[PDB]
Design a binder for these strands. Structure first.
Ligand SMILES: O=c1ccn([C@@H]2O[C@H](COP(=O)(O)OP(=O)(O)OP(=O)(O)O)[C@@H](O)[C@H]2O)c(=O)[nH]1
Ligand SMILES: [Cl-]
Ligand SMILES: [Cl-]
Ligand SMILES: [Mg+2]
Ligand SMILES: [Mg+2]
Ligand SMILES: [Mg+2]
Ligand code: NA
Length: 327
DNA sequence: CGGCATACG
DNA sequence: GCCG
């Protein structure tokens, strides 16, 4: 079992679901306390279990697996022996965890804002609604739409939404294309949002595109919230439903075609997969990876990629399709 | 021990 | 919290 998640296939569904879920609770709680390192270790340990070919049934099967030391091994040991880990259950029921989870789930509220509200004594969404002078416009939209945004987006919803985005994109710039990315590209059946990547086959034509797209969608009455030159939009869209509609989070990103493989790789995820790939690139290969390119800081050159396959090859990694990037 | 991903809004 |  290699140490980086980008070195091994990780499918969406696997054979250690309960164990991985428990470790991810501890990872999430570590993040709420500001410990990024602990969060990463617990996330990495969970992801190792997702990559195994069969269920862990005995503690001895953890021997030699990366990211399993005394703490993660004890969690697994307790789940195997008793079906429950006391530390995990204590986190689950804790007021701190439940409130930080509730607050950070809001679009526009991160850990730092949630923590400050927690320390001020706030606990519920109605607590926040009763003090709207303390909210940004983004947070107000996140709070007004919180209920709809807490409902999973279905893969059945995605097709309808891609068609409306394509219509606006085609008027904004004929020939521009829309690609589904994020979790749905990795095979998820549900999501918290829909992620799209937009480009045009003629380098340079995509400059200035996203404002033109957003203005068109707003004129069609489909935008419930957006932030307004720009190239990324994190919006709330109106999606039709039987006799009504619901609010859905949609992310739109524009990239030049020369950067498209890098942007597609970056926005397809998973989040852990991308962090691990970027860490691998820098620490093992001495190359700096981001959503725009892959840089050699010694030669001061960028690697020209025509496909995600090119990028895996240039990092010396076996290619993983999106469905195997569910780290 | 140092390190832990990344840039745009 | 774990790796090198
Ligand atoms: O902190 C982050 C968040 C997101 N991303 C990049 O943005 C992509 C989309 O980020 P999302 O937050 O939309 O996640 P997701 O689509 O994988 O899963 P859902 O919760 O939406 O179902 C991610 O898959 C990752 O590639 C990061 O690189 N870092
Ligand atoms: Cl590999
Ligand atoms: Cl690390
Ligand atoms: Mg998504
Ligand atoms: Mg998104
Ligand atoms: Mg230390
Ligand atoms: Na949030």
């Amino acid at each position: 079992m290699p140490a980086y998640a980008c070195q091994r296939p990780t499918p969406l569904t696997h054979h250690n679901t309960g164990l991985s879920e428990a470790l991810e609770i501890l990872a999430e709680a570590a993040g709420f306390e500001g410990s990024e390192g602990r969060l990463l270790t617990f996330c990495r340990a969970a992801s190792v279990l997702k990559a195994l070919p069969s269920p862990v049934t005995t503690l001895s099967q953890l021997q030699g697996l990366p990211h399993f030391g005394e703490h993660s091994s004890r969690v697994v040991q307790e789940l195997l022996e008793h079906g429950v880990c006391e530390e995990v259950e204590r986190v689950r029921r804790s007021e701190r965890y439940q409130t930080m989870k509730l607050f950070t789930q809001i679009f526009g509220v991160g850990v730092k804002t949630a923590d400050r509200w927690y320390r001020e004594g706030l606990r519920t969404l109605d607590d926040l609604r009763e003090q709207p002078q303390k909210l940004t416009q983004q947070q107000k939209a996140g709070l007004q739409h919180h209920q709809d945004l807490s409902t999973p987006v279905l893969r059945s919803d995605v097709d309808a939404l891609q068609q409306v985005v394509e219509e606006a994109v085609g008027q904004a710039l004929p020939g521009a294309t829309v690609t589904l990315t994020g979790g749905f590209r990795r095979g998820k059946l549900q999501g918290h949002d829909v992620d799209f990547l937009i480009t045009h086959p003629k380098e340079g034509q995509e400059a200035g595109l996203l404002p033109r797209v957003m203005c068109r969608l707003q004129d069609q009455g489909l935008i419930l919230y957006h932030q307004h030159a720009f190239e990324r939009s994190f919006c709330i869209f109106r999606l039709p439903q039987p006799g009504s509609w619901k609010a859905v989070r949609v992310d739109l990103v524009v990239a030049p075609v020369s950067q498209f493989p890098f942007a597609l790789l970056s926005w397809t995820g998973s989040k852990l997969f991308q962090r691990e790939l970027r860490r691998f690139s820098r620490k093992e290969k001495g190359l700096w990876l981001n959503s725009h390119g892959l840089f050699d800081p010694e030669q001061k050159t960028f690697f020209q990629a025509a496909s995600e396959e090119d990028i895996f090859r240039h990092l010396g990694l076996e290619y993983l399709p999106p469905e195997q990037r569910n780290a």
